[PDB]
From Swiss-Prot, chain A:
GO terms for molecular function: cysteine-type deubiquitinase activity; metal ion binding; metal-dependent deubiquitinase activity; metallopeptidase activity; proteasome binding. The gene is RPN11. It comes from Saccharomyces cerevisiae (strain ATCC 204508 / S288c). Its EC number is 3.4.19.12. N-acetylated by NAT3. This is Ubiquitin carboxyl-terminal hydrolase RPN11.
Swiss-Prot record, chain B:
Keywords: Acetylation, Phosphoprotein, Proteasome. The chain holds residues 2 to 178 of 338 of the full protein. N-acetylated by NAT1. Present with 19800 molecules/cell in log phase SD medium. The modification N-acetylserine is found at residue 1. This is 26S proteasome regulatory subunit RPN8. Disulfide bonds: none annotated. One of its GO terms (biological process) is ubiquitin-dependent protein catabolic process. Residues 7-142 form the MPN domain. GO terms for cellular component: proteasome complex; proteasome regulatory particle, lid subcomplex; proteasome storage granule. It comes from the Eukaryota.
Length: 166, 174
């Protein structure tokens, strides 16, 4: 079974970004590493700008992406694009036909690529509405992967400041 | 007095500062430095995002440091294309304490912020009793420039609240 591990900052950025974009869909890239055939670590993400074309391969601004990736390298983040995320405000986590086409473009660049989908409207305490997909290699076109969260001890202590009195 | 009264910091910013420090393998006495984003238009400064900066400083000489001005402008320009509500409001470093060069570094950020810059120290080692954050704005006294210490709280909008709870679930259980 395949698992996408999502880091603390990755998750918070994707929820934050999705909520900021409402009522529009948003998208960004996921950074991390392919650990083995069944494991993807997503250690970070970054947002792509809203485009007129809506969320599709056309929405990927190669100039923006190259500048952002180069500037991230300069400050210690030089992880592989391991996939992309997009929001579905109010209508749940799945891939539309256009989403499948986007994901096919990501897969042609790197067959291990993952599509994460988050719903910022239906996400509430304590229900994050999120899923991760790859396309299949009558049959369905895509399938869901397990999601889990990786946090360090240092990160755990840091997060506990939010309701520190508890 | 019309001075800022207090500062709130999003959990993302704390985690971003920590990730910056760790991913650059920052090693003692050194610190990492970056930009903070949010809203400083009121007596409550709200720190809601951040990005890392290239930064280098001379151990042998506090007066010697370098910040990439071009990096600040180029990254902020991308941040603006993503969310214009999150303005450049100051800078952060990993401390854990105020350093001799901070009032001079602060003067540089003053060229980029509309507000009087906020300095946020995020103690990524987390050896303090309370919050791993200390917030400062530069003021005149007597006359000379000095940092005024502002109280901090950690606060999250609903999205982050949901995220943090989700991340700490397995710890809550235990």
């Amino acid at each position: 079974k395949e698992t996408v591990y999502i880091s603390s900052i990755a998750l918070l950025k994707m929820l934050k970004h999705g909520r900021a974009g409402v009522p529009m869909e948003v998208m960004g890239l996921m950074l991390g590493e392919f650990v083995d055939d069944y494991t993807v670590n997503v250690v970070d993400v970054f947002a792509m700008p809203q485009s007129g074309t809506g969320v599709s391969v056309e929405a990927v601004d190669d100039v923006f992406q190259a500048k952002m990736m180069d500037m991230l390298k300069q400050t210690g983040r030089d992880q592989m694009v391991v996939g992309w995320y997009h929001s579905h405000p109010g209508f749940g986590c799945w891939l539309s036909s256009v989403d499948v086409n986007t994901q096919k473009s990501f897969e042609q660049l790197n067959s291990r690529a993952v599509a994460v989908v988050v719903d910022p409207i239906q996400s509430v305490k304590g229900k994050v509405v999120i899923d991760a997909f790859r396309l299949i290699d009558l049959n369905r076109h895509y399938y869901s992967l397990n999601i889990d969260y990786h946090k360090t001890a240092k990160e755990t202590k840091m997060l506990m400041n939010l309701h520190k009195e508890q | 007095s019309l001075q800022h009264e207090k500062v709130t910091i999003a959990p993302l910013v704390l985690l971003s500062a920590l990730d910056h420090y760790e991913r650059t393998q920052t090693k003692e006495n050194k610190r990492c430095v970056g930009v903070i984003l949010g809203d400083a238009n009121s007596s409550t400064i709200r720190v809601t995002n951040s990005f890392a900066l290239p930064f280098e400083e001379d151990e042998k000489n506090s007066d010697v440091w370098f910040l990439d001005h071009n990096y600040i402008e180029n990254m902020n320009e991308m941040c603006k294309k993503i969310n214009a509500k999150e303005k450049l409001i100051g800078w952060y470093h990993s401390g854990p304490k105020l350093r001799a060069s901070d009032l001079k570094i602060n003067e540089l950020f003053k060229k980029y912020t509309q507000n009087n810059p906020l300095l946020l120290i995020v103690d990524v080692k987390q050896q303090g009793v309370g919050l791993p954050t200390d917030a400062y704005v530069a003021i005149e006294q007597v006359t000379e420039k000095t940092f005024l210490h502002l109280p901090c709280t950690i606060e999250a909008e609903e999205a982050e609240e949901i995220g943090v709870e989700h991340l700490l679930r397995d710890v809550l259980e235990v």
